Amino acid sequence: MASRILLNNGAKMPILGLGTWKSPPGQVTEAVKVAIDVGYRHIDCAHVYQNENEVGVAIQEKLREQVVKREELFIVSKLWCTYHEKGLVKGACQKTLSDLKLDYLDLYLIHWPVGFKPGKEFFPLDESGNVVPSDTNILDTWAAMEELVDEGLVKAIGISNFNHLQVEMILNKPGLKYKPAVNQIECHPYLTQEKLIQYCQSKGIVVTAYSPLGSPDRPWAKPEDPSLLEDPRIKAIAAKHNKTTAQVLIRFPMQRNLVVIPKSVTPERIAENFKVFDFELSSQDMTTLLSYNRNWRVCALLSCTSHKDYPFHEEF
Numbered sequence: 001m002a003s004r005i006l007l008n009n010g011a012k013m014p015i016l017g018l019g020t021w022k023s024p025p026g027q028v029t030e031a032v033k034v035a036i037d038v039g040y041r042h043i044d045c046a047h048v049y050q051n052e053n054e055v056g057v058a059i060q061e062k063l064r065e066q067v068v069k070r071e072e073l074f075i076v077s078k079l080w081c082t083y084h085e086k087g088l089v090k091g092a093c094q095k096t097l098s099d100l101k102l103d104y105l106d107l108y109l110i111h112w113p114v115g116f117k118p119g120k121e122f123f124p125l126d127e128s129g130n131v132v133p134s135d136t137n138i139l140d141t142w143a144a145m146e147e148l149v150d151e152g153l154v155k156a157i158g159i160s161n162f163n164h165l166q167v168e169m170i171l172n173k174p175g176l177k178y179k180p181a182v183n184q185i186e187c188h189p190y191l192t193q194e195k196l197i198q199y200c201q202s203k204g205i206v207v208t209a210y211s212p213l214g215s216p217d218r219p220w221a222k223p224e225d226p227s228l229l230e231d232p233r234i235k236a237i238a239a240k241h242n243k244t245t246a247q248v249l250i251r252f253p254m255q256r257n258l259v260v261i262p263k264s265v266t267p268e269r270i271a272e273n274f275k276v277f278d279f280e281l282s283s284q285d286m287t288t289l290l291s292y293n294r295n296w297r298v299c300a301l302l303s304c305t306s307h308k309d310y311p312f313h314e315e316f
């Protein structure tokens with residue numbers, strides 16, 4: 001299948017990208033260099049991941065080496081929750097641009113719909129462990145994102161972890177100038193997201209699937225927790241196709257017209273994860289994988305459950 005999807009800003013986005021959350025700063029430069037050498041042209045980044053400088057070293061070296069042209073890369077980053085205020089958005093973007101060694105981003109996302117009190121801490125808490133909110137709403141934050149397009153800092157803007165009512169809130173924003181191009185959400189066979197994906201696709205918003213392997217390195221993993229990579233049912237589909245379980249989990253979202261961003265710092269896995277354009281899952285395989293949905297979420301924080309804009313109280 002085609003390697004890129006057309007966005008509603010007229011630009012093409014590679015459907016496979018490299019994730020970078022948890023990639024250690026002393027490993028991620030090599031990881032990104034390896035990824036570009038073996039064909040990745042999309043890197044998913046964020047200021048909160050604390051490794052954009054090191055990601056940037058890799059990107060710059062491959063540009064300098066003329067392995068790739070800047071126009072051929074699709075670099076994504078995200079506005080952290082403590083920068084939702086109007087007056088902080090441009091500087092947050094510029095800090096990311098500086099760390100990544102870029103003069104524009106292809107896509108910049110509102111990372112989470114929830115805004116937090118600005119300051120040095122990424123998760124400001126009160127004395128009982130609740131996050132301290134920002135009174136800035138998603139529509140004013142969106143207007144600030146729109147300004148970044150008009151200043152040439154970003155080619156496209158989008159959202160991440162927005163539920164359908166929140167997406168609808170931006171789509172219905174008075175004076176909306178740019179529609180979100182992308183909603184990046186968690187999506188895998190245990191959280192299949194049929195309702196939110198159809199909503200977004202029906203609006204011409206491209207959906208990016210994060211944690212496609214179930215984030216086995218997430219820091220809050222429990223023993224109890226389901227494991228996609230070890231699910232014998234998925235292992236059997238992989239065996240049938242002479243592919244790895246990871247490769248099935250990556251191809252699955254691709255065939256739903258999603259973008260997918262598996263993370264690895266292991267060079268052999270980075271290469272393996274890209275070798276997903278030479279096989280097809282059957283319609284039966286797809287429906288079978290969809291059937292494993294358990295509404296199981298890697299990413300959701302108890303500290304944020306009372307924030308006005310917490311996204312996961314809603315069904316979708």
Ligand SMILES: NC(=O)c1ccc[n+]([C@@H]2O[C@H](COP(=O)([O-])OP(=O)(O)OC[C@H]3O[C@@H](n4cnc5c(N)ncnc54)[C@H](OP(=O)(O)O)[C@@H]3O)[C@@H](O)[C@H]2O)c1
Pocket residue numbers: 018019020021022044045111160161184185209210211212213214215216217218229244246247261262263264265266269270272273298299
């Ligand atoms: N927008 C958001 O709020 C949000 C939230 C979560 C994630 N994301 C983005 O989505 C990315 C992907 O999600 P994720 O990092 O949570 O988890 P993931 O991609 O589902 O899983 C990454 C884990 O899988 C292992 N792995 C990778 N390829 C493998 C393979 N072929 N075989 C066996 N194990 C393999 C990795 O190990 P090694 O690295 O040790 O190889 C790592 O432990 C993130 O890195 C981030 O860029 C965005």
Ligand SMILES: O=C(O)COc1cc(Cl)ccc1C(=O)NCc1cccc([N+](=O)[O-])c1
Pocket residue numbers: 021046048049050081112114299300301302304305310311
């Ligand atoms: O968010 C990501 O991309 C991945 O997860 C990260 C990454 C880092 Cl570096 C730090 C913390 C997290 C995390 O707890 N994310 C979950 C989260 C955050 C904010 C709000 C919520 N929420 O539920 O409103 C949830």
